[PDB]
Paper text:
Structurally, [name] belongs to the Sucrose Non-Fermenting 2 (SNF2) family of ATPases and contains several identifiable domains and motifs, which provide specificity for a number of defined substrates. These include the amino-terminal SNF2 ATPase core, two [name] binding motifs (the [name] box and the APIM motif), a specific type of zinc-finger (Npl4 Zinc-Finger, NZF) and the HNH nuclease domain (named after the three most conserved residues). We further defined [name] as a key regulator of [name] function, which recruits [name] to the sites of stalled DNA replication and stimulates its endonuclease activity.
Three peptide molecules are visible in the structures, each of which interacts with a different monomer in the [name] trimer. Furthermore, Lys518 and His520 form main chain hydrogen bonds with Ile255 and Pro253 of [name], respectively. On the other hand, residues Ile522-Phe526 form a 310 helix that orients the conserved hydrophobic residues (also known as the ‘hydrophobic plug’; Ile522, Phe525 and Phe526 in the [name] [name] box) for docking into the hydrophobic patch on the [name] surface.
Author numbering:
A (entry chain E), B (entry chain A), C (entry chain C): 1 to 255
Amino acid sequence: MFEARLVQGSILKKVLEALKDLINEACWDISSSGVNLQSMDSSHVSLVQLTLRSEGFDTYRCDRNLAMGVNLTSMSKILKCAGNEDIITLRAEDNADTLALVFEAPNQEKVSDYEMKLMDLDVEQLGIPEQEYSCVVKMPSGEFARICRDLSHIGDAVVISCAKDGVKFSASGELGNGNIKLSQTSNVDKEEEAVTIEMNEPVQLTFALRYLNFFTKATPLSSTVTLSMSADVPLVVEYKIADMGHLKYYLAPKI
Amino acid sequence: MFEARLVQGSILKKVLEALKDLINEACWDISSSGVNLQSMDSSHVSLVQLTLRSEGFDTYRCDRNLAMGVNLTSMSKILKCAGNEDIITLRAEDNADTLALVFEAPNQEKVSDYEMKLMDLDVEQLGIPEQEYSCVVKMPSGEFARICRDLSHIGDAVVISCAKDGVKFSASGELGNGNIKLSQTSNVDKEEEAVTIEMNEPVQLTFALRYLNFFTKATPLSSTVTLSMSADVPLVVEYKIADMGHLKYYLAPKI
Amino acid sequence: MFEARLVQGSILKKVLEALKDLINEACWDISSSGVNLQSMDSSHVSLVQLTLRSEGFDTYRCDRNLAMGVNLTSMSKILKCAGNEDIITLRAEDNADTLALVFEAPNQEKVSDYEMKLMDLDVEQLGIPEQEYSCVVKMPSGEFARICRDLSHIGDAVVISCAKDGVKFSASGELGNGNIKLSQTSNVDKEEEAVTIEMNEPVQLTFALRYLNFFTKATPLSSTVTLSMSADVPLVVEYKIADMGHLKYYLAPKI
Ligand code: NA
Ligand code: NA
Ligand code: NA
Ligand code: NA
């Protein structure tokens, strides 16, 4: 058996909402160390990496390593049948070809069991050589989402320019152009309100806004987001999933 | 004249919202005892019965029995022009054949009058035999609505059964299957939260979820809903309209 | 240079939202005395006049008079990138063919600069003649908006009838008819509920509800609206923009 019980089930709801518009189907790699998923979008512009560590679950059992092929649209539809306060259990019997999802309402005597048909996927995994970035910007996730939404009404590409003291986002199109400058904050009450820049050298890169707007579907997972940038390599947009791991999106820059 | 004054005019707004998507037109039978309406949907799968007793109105006068043919879409449009706190009066002047609606805003100096054209309807209407049911479930209306909504995203038919400690709902379709068990418990704050099951013998029946999702448009009328079930007869879904009567929906089962 | 700083930037957001569906493109006339705009809709049934006086701005400089041709759809898209609490500055360098818009977030270290491309417009500007009105009604803007929305579900034309005691709105269509009467309030000065009538003689006029329902996009600018009416002349629907001026819509009657 594989069995993972998650008291904060809404985490899984949010994870699916953060994946299903970008990726139609993916392999969920289950092992004793937790749940991993890596997948490229169909136009091969971006890659998403999910980690949910075994220790983040309330109980966790994995007797054999699995690669479950999942239609993410189907799994999203099922997770929409869970209430936000539900305890959610994922379960797969060693030799079965389905994934079971159990939703327990904690302040109600309601229990739902869903059985999702799996699919056969040949996914070749790709190694992300780890690296050091020229600029890492940490900022409120809502602010990043608003910026990418607003600029997408101006143009389809955003130039992200980062220096010591601020980050600038600019776009250009038929109606004209726009630039948004966020300065580094000094004094904030809540760390989560900060803008923080760690800069080794300045960078200026161009990215497709449509893809950024897919990424910001993760916004409910975290109050903050980090952008990691170097010349000639993909941007990494990272959302921590507290106690569990993360969702990282990689976006190839424009030439 | 017919004249009926309802201080809680939102009741009528809710009733029309509960009817108009299922039934396009119906006869409103007005007598001294109140308002009665019975109608089949156009595919002859379901029947709806409304009762609003004279004593539930603030004032009520009916000099002669009427059968007013009403386009429910039209009446709904008119009742949408009433505020939720309005006092609503229905009137048919001594020998008119329109229905007049008057909306008085209780905390504002605004009065609206609407005159709705009636239509000629030839309805044969049906005898409801009293019967006893094998299982009668009372449960929170919002929970029933959520269940029917969720399961309709899984399949188009629901199998409803009763265990001695709960009621079960299941559905099956392209993406897989779901099963929901609502169990009884004494740990409720409010009576309206209670699941009550009166069972003479167990039942298992299948019904079209699309029709159930029309019926749950009545959810605003009551915190609770009653399901009455026997083998080989229609399901009855009943919403009490407190102090006034009820809206009952009957649904023919599938084999 | 032209430069106008507005601490209550949401005013400009609200103005564009009030204009852009009715008028696609218009000339913004800039002088030392402030900002003026006048335009007809494409079907030549209505005219809009905007005034924003220089003294309503927090700072205002205009070195030379301008006639900036603006695609309102484009300017709306840009102003939707401003937060509701933003300070908004409009700026145009004497010889440039663009309008700059700067949005400062007051409780955040975020500054946005947008440059909007202008267009060449040949607009003939119309003389508004000498006209004394038979009736002038002041009433809550939200109530006027609700009335025009509700009646547009009954018919496509409203008859507006004004007398000493009240103003009446009526419509007639396929399903029947509706009439709404608003009485003059004795105690007043609560803008959100006061109805006040100044009447030389009673009037009754007919107008196209579809245009009124464009005008009420201005509702957020003011708690109150003023309707000015005489026989055989356009209705004036006026929204005060406190500290600044007004937005006035003129609508030709149906004869
Ligand atoms: Na439970
Ligand atoms: Na009143
Ligand atoms: Na029981
Ligand atoms: Na600031």
